[PDB]
Design a protein around this nucleic acid. Structure first.
Length: 304
RNA sequence: AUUGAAAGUUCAAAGCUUAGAUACCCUGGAGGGAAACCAGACUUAACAC
């Protein structure tokens, strides 16, 4: 039902190329969680060139990711190039604060992203530099000096997701998994948890990157205010497929932690023919289009 | 079936070099070899009567 991913050690979720150190994301993308879960549930017989088909077959609908620090729940929130983790008690008045007056707008939002921001109390950015040594000289092998900015945790942190199917939630319990990038470790634990679904509010929080079908890109973009009140829109890669050893895709997405307006739902519902409808239904199945209500902890997918 | 897999911050490297516990500094100042004390005490023996 509810799955807590507890990182045993600093993590690495590489983003935006490798070219001082390569930076890590705060919240891992849903493709990473889906890939770890499929890695657990894998069987070496269902192979197909469609990574997400073989991945949707291995599991069920996964709901987006947030932070459980110590009983508290933190949620991503971005204003544009400004990520933060806030407890939902500060998301309540947010829509009121959105089309509130100007100076009150900046007062409130910059009090949220700076003092109410619980990111740095939780997250440290730990640069790690490694090298490679040739086994006969015992001096650094030439050209092998790499760096990466890992995501260290000051206090114990969990990533929270919700999975619908309860059959896999038995062979997922207590598994030690290779969560993330350069061979780091996290533990999964499964617990029964109660979460509402599909509330009809006006302002939702993108818990996961809301994908855009690359057909309504111009449509969605040239009038952007109609769908997102605050957040970031960026072209993101969908990761790396283990089977064929390639990058996955690139799609414009509404980065997790954005504030979406109810209209976006109907918009996405009107711009998908059967083909890409099935495609993006799969995408949502593995966990991309997850919304939460600023009211309370109540999730819903956009299409499903 | 994870923007993945793989990769030792490793190698060489003397806390060394110059550098005086030295300079100035009286065992001196104060302090009576003094205080007390009789060169004195006393006659005895013998026989005669």
């Amino acid at each position: 039902k509810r799955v807590l991913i507890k990182p045993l050690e600093p993590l690495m979720f590489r983003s935006q190329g490798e070219f001082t150190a390569a930076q890590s994301l705060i919240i891992p993308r849903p493709s990473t969680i889906a890939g770890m879960l499929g890695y657990i549930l894998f069987n070496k017989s269902s192979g197909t060139g469609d990574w997400l088909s073989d991945l949707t077959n291995l599991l069920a609908t996964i709901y987006g990711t947030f932070i459980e620090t110590n009983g508290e729940y933190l949620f991503p929130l971005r204003m544009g190039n400004h990520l933060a983790l806030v407890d939902q008690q500060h998301l309540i008045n947010l829509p009121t604060l959105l089309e509130k007056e100007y100076e009150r707008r900046e007062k409130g939002i910059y009090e949220l992203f700076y003092d109410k921001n619980k990111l740095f109390q939780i997250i440290n950015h730990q640069d790690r530099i490694g090298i490679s040594i040739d086994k006969s000289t015992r001096t650094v092998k030439e050209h092998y000096l790499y760096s990466a900015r890992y995501l260290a945790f000051k206090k114990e942190v969990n990533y929270v997701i919700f999975i619908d199917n309860d059959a896999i939630s038995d062979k997922i319990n207590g598994k030690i998994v290779n969560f993330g990038g350069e061979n780091r470790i996290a533990k999964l634990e499964v617990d029964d948890y109660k979460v509402d679904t599909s509330i009809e509010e006006e302002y939702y929080l993108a818990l996961s990157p809301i994908l855009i079908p690359d057909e309504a890109l111009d449509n969605f973009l040239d009038n952007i205010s109609d769908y997102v009140a605050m957040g970031k829109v960026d072209k993101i890669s969908l990761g790396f497929d283990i089977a064929n050893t390639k990058r996955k895709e690139m799609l414009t997405a509404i980065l997790e932690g954005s504030i979406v307006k109810r209209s976006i739902i109907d918009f996405i519902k009107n711009e998908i023919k059967n083909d890409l409808r099935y495609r993006f239904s799969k995408y949502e199945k593995i966990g991309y289009n997850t919304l939460m209500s600023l009211c309370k902890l109540a999730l819903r997918k956009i299409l499903s």
